[PDB]
Design a protein around this ligand. Structure first.
Ligand SMILES: *[C@@H]1O[C@H](CO)[C@@H](O[C@@H]2O[C@H](CO)[C@@H](O[C@@H]3O[C@H](CO)[C@@H](O)[C@H](O)[C@@H]3O)[C@H](O)[C@H]2NC(C)=O)[C@H](O)[C@H]1NC(C)=O
Ligand SMILES: *[C@@H]1O[C@H](CO)[C@@H](O[C@@H]2O[C@H](CO)[C@@H](O[C@@H]3O[C@H](CO)[C@@H](O)[C@H](O)[C@@H]3O)[C@H](O)[C@H]2NC(C)=O)[C@H](O)[C@H]1NC(C)=O
Ligand SMILES: *[C@@H]1O[C@H](CO)[C@@H](O[C@@H]2O[C@H](CO)[C@@H](O)[C@H](O)[C@H]2NC(C)=O)[C@H](O)[C@H]1NC(C)=O
Ligand SMILES: *[C@@H]1O[C@H](CO)[C@@H](O[C@@H]2O[C@H](CO)[C@@H](O)[C@H](O)[C@H]2NC(C)=O)[C@H](O)[C@H]1NC(C)=O
Ligand SMILES: *[C@@H]1O[C@H](CO)[C@@H](O[C@@H]2O[C@H](CO)[C@@H](O)[C@H](O)[C@H]2NC(C)=O)[C@H](O)[C@H]1NC(C)=O
Ligand SMILES: *[C@@H]1O[C@H](CO)[C@@H](O)[C@H](O)[C@H]1NC(C)=O
Ligand SMILES: *[C@@H]1O[C@H](CO)[C@@H](O)[C@H](O)[C@H]1NC(C)=O
Ligand SMILES: *[C@@H]1O[C@H](CO)[C@@H](O)[C@H](O)[C@H]1NC(C)=O
Lengths: 49, 163, 245, 197, 49
């Protein structure tokens, strides 16, 4: 995405920081959270095995 | 992962299930809706039965639940009088909660009295059993037992276990 | 029991002729019900889950009584016996404002859960007024199949029903036609369908096989031929002829 | 977008293709086997004869249907065509289903937007409290944010529990409707359509 | 951690809703023991499906 010359930050619908302009080379970037989730265990019953 | 299709015993998601079979391991597959079948159709063809069968099926439904009662001041404040004084600053939390729990307890007795009390009088079976070959020994009360319960009812009474 | 058969589409004839076979089937069918409840207690699951849910809700309420909630101790007697009056109210007010939230959550959930029980209780009352006090023509309400009668039984915090049902067993193949015209007048059945044995024709009821001879006591006349698509040529009886001789 | 905070969706157990197979199975059964397969093994029957039984149970003699078979057939086909075109009208027929989706979006959006409220503290970022304050003077401010976000969470969950009751009530009605209107014939008035069934 | 079990109390409630969704759709559609198929020839006396 392209920005304005005085533009520095970027947001989304949920007002969250998404993109930042490089302070040393006026380049653009993106920021996204990385992997996370839950874990589940499948068992057939402690009696059988 | 296997190619075959089976039933559902342990759901996973998006049409996958897991089961224990036999060496012995854990398998993953895709569920099967049922056996495929087709019916012959024609514009002058019909089918008619010739013999019949008689079956019996059961259904189980809940009716009521156990009543409870909680004292507002006793639980959150103990027996100390210094605690109780600060509680009076809040207006009517203790009385609000007690009314809600009392309404549930009264309602429970209404549910059980609306599903069983549907006969004005009480009838008694004749002393002599003769119904043209029909036997009802598993439903009628048994005078031998201490309490008037049927053999089916007794088997159900101990099956459910209730500090 | 004959009237129950008459209300499902089968005449009184069948019940009286096969009385012995029906009675043995019914008595043997009851025996399986008692054995079927001796398996793993997965049949009584619906009644058990209600009891378990009230156990978890009550236990969590007690477990909340051992939380500091940001204070220095979780016992009221300890606080009143270690601090002066004017410094006590700061710590006590934090315990009170925490225990009220715990108590409100318990009652709110109980009000919602009590609604489900009442909704299921209303269904049981309806079932005890239609299935067991009479005969119902609704499909898949009092069991799977054609309904005959029902019996109630008692259980802790619930009710268990028993249903009796009539189900067809074996089937054959035949050939059928809409109507037949004999003297230029179309003929239609009163209660039944036309069945082609292979060389003759007959009339029988839909739910049981009993061939009969086509007479004027089983048909009514209306219209001429070449209007119905599949008219078939055959003969009628008119049983008034033999006494005319 | 960007999966926001710790929110997930989880997939349904039965895929849309699998649901379409049950509906196809029911349609095939009723055309060929009539209502027989609703209770017991299926038995074949010609379709015009099957429609004759429906007329008999409503109080009309079998004579009428056979004599006017051509006229009845054309009326049925014409009625079907009007249904397809009328669903292309103003999106009011599908109003009931679209209301469910809209309500969930409002409930979930409000929960996320609640994360940017001070609740009586200096700011609304956890790191800024830690970065610009000493430890002993930070637990007082943090305890204000924690109690604020619990009320927001419990409010959302309580609303969902109530709303799930209405859906279950509607689901039970559909199950009863299928067991009576499509797998048989009903004498109840105004239950399956407007008029005789 | 000073609050006792608020986090675990909420998670149990939300899981019950998720499971009930699968129960609803199973009780409205899965009502046939077998799966039938239509004959290849479509001649039903004049009705077009
Ligand atoms: C109606 O059916 C019930 C049960 O189906 C009949 O009562 C039961 O009859 C059986 C007959 O085998 C009794 O079994 C007993 O087993 C002992 C084992 O030692 C044996 O010594 C006895 O001679 C007898 O065979 C059983 O006790 C009896 N009662 C119950 C509760 O099962 C009943 O007779 C049937 N009614 C009619 C009119 O046929
Ligand atoms: C059952 O009803 C359907 C729906 O009417 C019938 O399908 C329709 O058949 C006609 C036959 O000519 C189609 O008309 C043609 O449409 C094309 C479309 O580009 C047009 O270019 C041709 O000049 C011609 O008009 C029609 O499209 C088709 N579909 C619809 C929605 O009408 C079907 O034939 C009927 N079944 C039987 C066995 O007749
Ligand atoms: C209808 O079915 C019943 C049972 O399904 C048949 O009765 C049995 O027939 C077999 C055939 O040899 C006998 O061995 C059994 O003793 C009969 N009774 C029972 C309880 O099994 C009956 O014959 C069938 N009717 C017709 C017309 O075939
Ligand atoms: C006769 O009844 C039997 C049992 O309902 C069926 O026979 C099947 O007929 C089809 C083709 O007509 C065959 O593909 C099947 O293999 C047959 N099955 C058996 C078990 O024989 C069918 O309903 C009727 N068939 C005829 C020709 O009348
Ligand atoms: C079906 O038709 C067959 C012949 O096509 C019938 O068999 C004979 O029918 C005649 C009728 O005049 C009887 O007199 C005979 O006693 C029958 N049996 C034999 C061995 O000839 C048969 O009765 C008809 N009905 C059924 C149910 O099969
Ligand atoms: C099972 O599916 C895999 C998936 O590609 C395939 O490679 C394999 O040949 C299949 N096995 C059989 C027996 O069909
Ligand atoms: C039944 O279908 C056949 C086609 O195989 C046709 O020849 C016959 O005329 C049809 N019967 C009637 C009554 O239309
Ligand atoms: C029935 O009899 C009429 C009288 O001539 C005849 O025209 C017609 O073809 C006959 N139908 C059959 C199926 O033989």
């Amino acid at each position: 995405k392209k920005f304005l010359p005085f533009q520095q930050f970027g947001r989304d619908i949920a007002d969250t920081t998404d993109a930042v302009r490089d302070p040393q080379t006026l380049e653009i970037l993106d920021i996204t959270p990385c992997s996370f989730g839950g874990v589940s265990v499948i068992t057939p019953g402690t009696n059988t095995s | 992962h296997v190619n075959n299709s089976y039933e559902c015993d342990i759901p996973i998601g998006a049409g996958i299930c897991a089961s224990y079979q036999t060496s012995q391991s854990i398998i993953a597959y895709t569920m099967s809706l049922g056996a495929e079948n087709s019916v012959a159709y024609s514009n002058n063809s019909i089918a008619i039965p010739t013999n019949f069968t008689i079956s019996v099926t059961t259904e189980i439904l809940p009716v009521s639940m156990t009543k409870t009662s909680v004292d507002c001041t006793m639980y959150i404040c103990g027996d100390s009088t210094e605690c109780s004084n600060l509680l009076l600053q809040y207006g009517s939390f203790c009385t609000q909660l007690n009314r809600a729990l009392t309404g549930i307890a009264v309602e429970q007795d209404k549910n059980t009295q609306e599903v069983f009390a549907q006969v004005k009088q009480i009838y008694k079976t004749p002393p002599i059993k003769d119904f043209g070959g029909f036997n009802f020994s598993q439903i009628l009360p048994d005078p031998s037992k201490p309490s008037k319960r049927s053999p089916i009812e007794d088997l159900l009474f101990n099956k459910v276990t209730l500090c | 029991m004959a009237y129950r058969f008459n209300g499902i589409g089968v005449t009184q004839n069948v019940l009286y002729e096969n009385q012995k076979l029906i009675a043995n089937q019914f008595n043997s069918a009851i025996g399986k019900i008692q054995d079927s409840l001796s398996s793993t207690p997965s049949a009584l699951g619906k009644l058990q889950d209600v009891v378990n849910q009230n156990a978890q809700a009550l236990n969590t309420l007690v477990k909340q009584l051992s939380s500091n909630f940001g204070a220095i101790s979780s016992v009221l007697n300890d606080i009143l016996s270690r601090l002066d009056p004017p410094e006590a109210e700061v710590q006590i007010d934090r315990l009170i404002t925490g225990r009220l939230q715990s108590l409100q959550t318990y009652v709110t959930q109980q009000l919602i859960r009590a609604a489900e029980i009442r909704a299921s209780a209303n269904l049981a009352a309806t079932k005890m007024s239609e299935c067991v006090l009479g005969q119902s023509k609704r499909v898949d309400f009092c069991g799977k199949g054609y309904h005959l009668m029902s019996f109630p039984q008692s259980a802790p915090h619930g009710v268990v029903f028993l249903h009796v049902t009539y189900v067809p067993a074996q089937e054959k193949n035949f050939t059928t036609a809409p109507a037949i015209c004999h003297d230029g007048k179309a003929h239609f059945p009163r209660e039944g369908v036309f069945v082609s044995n292979g060389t003759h024709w007959f009339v029988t009821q839909r739910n049981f096989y009993e061939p009969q001879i086509i007479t004027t006591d089983n048909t009514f006349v209306s219209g001429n031929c070449d209007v119905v698509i599949g008219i078939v040529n055959n003969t009628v009886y008119d049983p008034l002829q033999p006494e005319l001789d | 977008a960007q999966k926001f905070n710790g929110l997930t969706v989880l997939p349904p157990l039965l895929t849309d293709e699998m649901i379409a197979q049950y509906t196809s199975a029911l349609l095939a059964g009723t055309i060929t086997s009539g209502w027989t397969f609703g209770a017991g093994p299926a038995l074949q029957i010609p379709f015009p004869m099957q429609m004759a039984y429906r007329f008999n149970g409503i109080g009309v003699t079998q004579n009428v249907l056979y004599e006017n078979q051509k006229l009845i057939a054309n009326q049925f086909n014409s009625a079907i065509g009007k249904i397809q075109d009328s669903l292309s009208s103003t999106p009011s027929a599908l109003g009931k289903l679209q209301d469910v989706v809209n309500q969930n979006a409002q409930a979930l959006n409000t929960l996320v937007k609640q994360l940017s409220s001070n609740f009586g503290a200096i700011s609304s970022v956890l790191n800024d409290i830690l970065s610009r304050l000493d430890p002993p003077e930070a637990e007082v401010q943090i305890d204000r944010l924690i109690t604020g976000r619990l009320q927001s969470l419990q409010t959302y969950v309580t609303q969902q529990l109530i709303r799930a009751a209405e859906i279950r009530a509607s689901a039970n009605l559909a199950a009863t409707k299928m067991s009576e209107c499509v797998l048989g014939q009903s004498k109840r008035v105004d239950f399956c359509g407007k008029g005789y069934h």
